[PDB]
Amino acid sequence: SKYQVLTVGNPNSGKTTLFNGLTGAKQQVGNWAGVTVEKKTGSFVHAGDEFSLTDLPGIYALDSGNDIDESIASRAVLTHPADVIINVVDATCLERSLYMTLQLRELRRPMIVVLNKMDALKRERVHLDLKQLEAFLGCPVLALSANNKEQVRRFKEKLHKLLVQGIALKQIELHYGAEFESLIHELEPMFAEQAVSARALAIRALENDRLVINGLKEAERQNVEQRQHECQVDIDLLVANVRYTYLHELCTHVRRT
Ligand SMILES: Nc1nc2c(ncn2[C@@H]2O[C@H](COP(=O)(O)OP(=O)(O)O)[C@@H](O)[C@H]2O)c(=O)[nH]1
C-alpha cells in the first residue's frame, strides 16, 4: 500500500527533527504549486508499505484573511490528499499549540496529534494524562521525543497500525454560542458535498478564510459577508474565546505538576 501523510504544526514544535527522523536522506525540496514557497517531501518504507510525506511550513493558525504560509497550510489542509494529517505539538506549550489543533479537528479529516519534547516536559516535572487528552480532542494522541531514534522507530509502528485500522474520530463538542451557531447553520448548506465537513467550511468562511471565500461565486460571497455583518460581536475574537476556553478546560484535566 502507499500512504500519503501531511505534517503540520507551529514553528519550533520539532517538526523538522521528526521529519528527518522519519525520512532520513530520502527527502526532496521543490515548490508549492502556483507560488515560490519551498515544498519539502520525503518517503520511507515500513513493513512493505510506502509512506509519502509532505511537510507544511510552520503556522500558528489557518488562514483568516488577514494582512503566505497560512494560505499554503489552509490550502493543503482543505484540499491536499492525505490518509492522515500528523499535527506535531510541543507538549511544553499546550495552550498555544492546540489552537491550530482545534481548527484541524473541526475539518474532520483523519489526523493524529504527536506530542513532541516529552523529555523537556519531564524536566519540568509536568505529567500529562494522555487518555484524557485523547478524550478532549477525539483523535489519537501519540507522545514522544523526536530527538530519540528508538521512539521514532516505535512511532512508525504505531502510525502504520493506525493507518491500516483506519482512524476513528469523535468530533469535538465545540459550541460557539446560539448566535454564531445560527450563522453556521445558515451557511452550512452551501458547503455540502465537499471533501471537508460543511460545518468546518462555514466556520472558515465566517473567519474569512481566503481559500474558502475565493472559490465562491459573487452571490455566495455576498451571502457570506452578510452573515458576517449579522454577528453583533467580532468574529475573530469570538472564535478565539471559544477555542481558548475549551483549551483552558482541557489543560485543567490533562496537566498535573
Ligand atoms: N528537548 C527536545 N527538543 C527537541 C525535540 N525535537 C526537536 N527539538 C528541538 O526543537 C528545536 C526546533 O526543532 P525543529 O525540528 O527545527 O522545529 P520546527 O521549526 O518545528 O521544524 C530544535 O532545537 C530541536 O533540537 C525533542 O524531542 N526534545
Domain ranges of the chain: 2-165, 178-244
How far is the C-alpha of 72 from the C-alpha of 59, rounded, in Å?
10
Closest-CA residue, ligand 1 atom 13, reads 14
Alpha-carbon span 22 to 58, nearest angstrom: 18
Q: From CA 97, how far away is CA 10, in angstroms rounded?
A: 6
- Which residue(s) pair with 53 in the sheet? 5, 42
**To the nearest 10°, the Cα dihedral for 167, 57, 187, 99?**
70
Which residue is closest in CA terms to ligand 1's atom 8?
14
Q: Which helix (H) or strand (E) holds 203?
A: helix 198-206
Whether 147 is in the pocket of ligand 1, judged by its Cβ within 6 Å, is yes
Q: What is the sign, positive or negative, of the torsion defined by CA atoms of 149, 155, 159, 160?
A: positive
Structural contact between residues 153 and 127, judged by C-beta atoms closer than 8 angstroms: no
Centre of ligand 1 to C-alpha 214, Å, is: 35
Angstrom distances, CA of residue 43 to CA of 12, 28, 77, 118: 22, 9, 19, 25
- Burial of residue 1, with CB atoms counted within 10 A of its CB: 0-12 exposed, 13-18 middle, 19 or more buried: exposed
Q: Is 55 annotated as a binding residue?
A: yes
Q: For ligand 1, say whether the CB of 69 is within 6 Å of any of its atoms.
A: no
Check the annotation: does 54 bind a ligand. Answer: no
Burial 44-64 (b: 16+ CB within 10 A, else e): beeeeeebbbbbbbbbebbbb
- Residue 149, annotated ligand binder? no
Place of cell 510541543: 90
The three grid cell numbers given for residue 174, joined into one nine-digit string: 465545540
For residues 98, 104, 107, 108, the Cα torsion angle rounded to the nearest 10 degrees is: -80
Torsion, Cα of 193, 199, 203, 209 (10° steps): -30
Residue pair 87/65 in contact by the 8 Å Cβ criterion:
no
147 C-alpha to ligand 1 centroid (Å): 7
In 3-state terms, what secondary structure has residue 223?
helix
CB contact burial 192-207 (16+ within 10 A = b; e otherwise): eeeebbbbbbbbbbbb
- What technique determined this structure? X-ray
Rounded to the nearest 5 degrees, what angle is found at the Cα of 136, between the Cα atoms of 97 and 206?
65
Q: Check if the beta carbon of residue 227 is closer than 8 Å to that of residue 204.
A: no
CATH topology (fold) of 2-165: Rossmann fold (3.40.50)
Determine the Cα–Cα distance for residues 115 and 251; give it in Å rounded to an integer: 14
**Which one-letter amino acid corresponds to residue 211?**
L
Annotated ligand binding at 197? The verdict is no
Q: Give the bridge partners for 89, in sequence order.
A: 115
| Cα–ligand 1 centroid distance for 80 (angstroms) | 25
Ligand 1 centroid to Cα of residue 13, in Å, is 6
Distance (Å) from CA 27 to ligand 1 centroid: 18
Query: Which of the listed residues 7, 8, 13, 17 should we mutate to test ligand 1's pocket, taking the one with most ligand atoms within 8 A of CB?
Result: 17
Distance, in Å, from the CA atom of 171 to the CA atom of 199, rounded to the nearest integer, reads 11
Phi and psi at residue 42, to the nearest 5°: -165, 170
Domain covering 178-244 in this structure, CATH number: 1.10.287.1770
Q: For the chain, where are the E strands, in sequence order? A: 2-9, 27-31, 38-46, 49-55, 84-90, 111-116, 127-128, 141-143, 255-256
196 DSSP 8-state letter: S
Look up residue 43 and give its DSSP letter.
E
Q: Are strands 255-256 and 2-9 parallel, antiparallel or unpaired?
A: unpaired
**Lookup result for grid cell 515500513:** 46
Residue nearest (by alpha carbon) to ligand 1 atom 14: 14
In the three-class reduction of DSSP (H, G, I as helix; E, B as strand; rest coil), residue 90 is classed as: strand
The residue nearest atom 21 of ligand 1, judged by CA position, is 16
Check pocket membership of 16 for ligand 1, CB cut-off 6 A.
yes
Which amino acid type is present at position 139? Answer: C
Resolution of this deposited model, Å = 1.8
